[PDB]
């Protein structure tokens, strides 16, 4: 239309799809350090990472081992069928934060003693629920005596 | 029912003994006691003892 497309705008950053194409054992540890942060360990895996600055650094140092794609934030909502009237920050607010392998904690002990207190909140939630039916059953049966007095 | 091979951990009986040199020393009760440290003199030789009693 020979003019700058005008109006209220948006901005749609990218999203990468990286995959190893070479054995990461061959290189130093400084590089495979940058390949764990991409959640990549073996030739042939794949992941989908944002394009935010702290990820271009980790990719700038492994550019000879990965192959990169670039998905925009309309291709994403199109690759998977998503209505345009949905965003992504709200659609992601549904899945809990304790997904498979919830998050990365420093040690493998701190990964265990975190999965432990998640197997405890299940025990507790079953016990607290049984505690109410001993607290409710009480208060009423605690009233039957008083209710007898009036 | 295992052999606490030092610097290697518990090992099966009948297992591998190739890496249990210093373990065959501890069992014999033989104590080197870190005596290859000739160079660094411990507080033992340089500690003035008060009190001829103690």
């Amino acid at each position: 239309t020979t003019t700058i497309a005008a109006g209220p705008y948006r901005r749609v950053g990218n999203v990468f799809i990286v995959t190893c194409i070479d054995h990461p054992f061959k290189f130093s540890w400084e590089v495979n350090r940058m390949l764990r942060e991409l959640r990549l360990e073996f030739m042939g895996q794949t992941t989908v990472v944002p394009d935010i600055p702290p990820v271009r650094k980790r990719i700038w140092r492994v550019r000879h081992v990965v192959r990169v794609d670039q998905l925009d934030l309309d291709e994403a909502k199109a690759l998977i069928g998503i209505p345009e009237h949905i965003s992504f920050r709200d659609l992601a607010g549904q899945i809990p934060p304790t997904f498979g392998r919830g998050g990365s904690v420093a040690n493998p002990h701190m990964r265990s003693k975190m999965n432990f207190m998640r197997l405890r909140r299940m025990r507790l939630r079953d016990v607290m629920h049984r505690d109410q039916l001993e607290k409710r059953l009480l208060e009423e049966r605690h009233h039957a005596l008083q209710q007898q007095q009036q | 029912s295992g052999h606490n091979v030092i610097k290697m951990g518990w090992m099966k009986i009948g297992g591998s003994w190739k890496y249990s040199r210093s373990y065959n020393d501890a069992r014999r009760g033989f104590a080197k006691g870190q005596w290859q440290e000739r160079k660094m003199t411990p507080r033992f030789m340089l500690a003035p003892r008060v009190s001829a009693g103690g």
Partner: protein, 94 residues
């Protein structure tokens, strides 16, 4: 207690400065709690930036543990997993 000096050592060898008390048992109670590295001498908290010392053994142990190839690589030189397996061992003798 903010230092702003070349602060001191602790109270190993003590010249006692009394004010008023029973006090007839100071240097017999000032060399009694001085060998267990202790209070009962009030310990004179000095050197408010002792963080730079917790960040030395943070670096002097993360730069000497990387002297042996820090290796978030793997169990080093895998090359035989990445197909699939359960790695066994290799006794050190080295």
């Amino acid at each position: 207690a903010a230092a702003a000096a070349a602060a001191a050592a602790a109270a190993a060898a003590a010249a006692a400065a009394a004010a008023a008390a029973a006090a007839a048992a100071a240097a017999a109670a000032a060399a009694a709690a001085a060998a267990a590295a202790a209070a009962a001498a009030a310990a004179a908290a000095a050197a408010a930036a002792a963080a730079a010392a917790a960040a030395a053994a943070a670096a002097a142990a993360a730069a000497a543990a990387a002297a042996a190839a820090a290796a978030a690589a793997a169990a080093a030189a895998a090359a035989a997993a990445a197909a699939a397996a359960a790695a066994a061992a290799a006794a050190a003798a080295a």
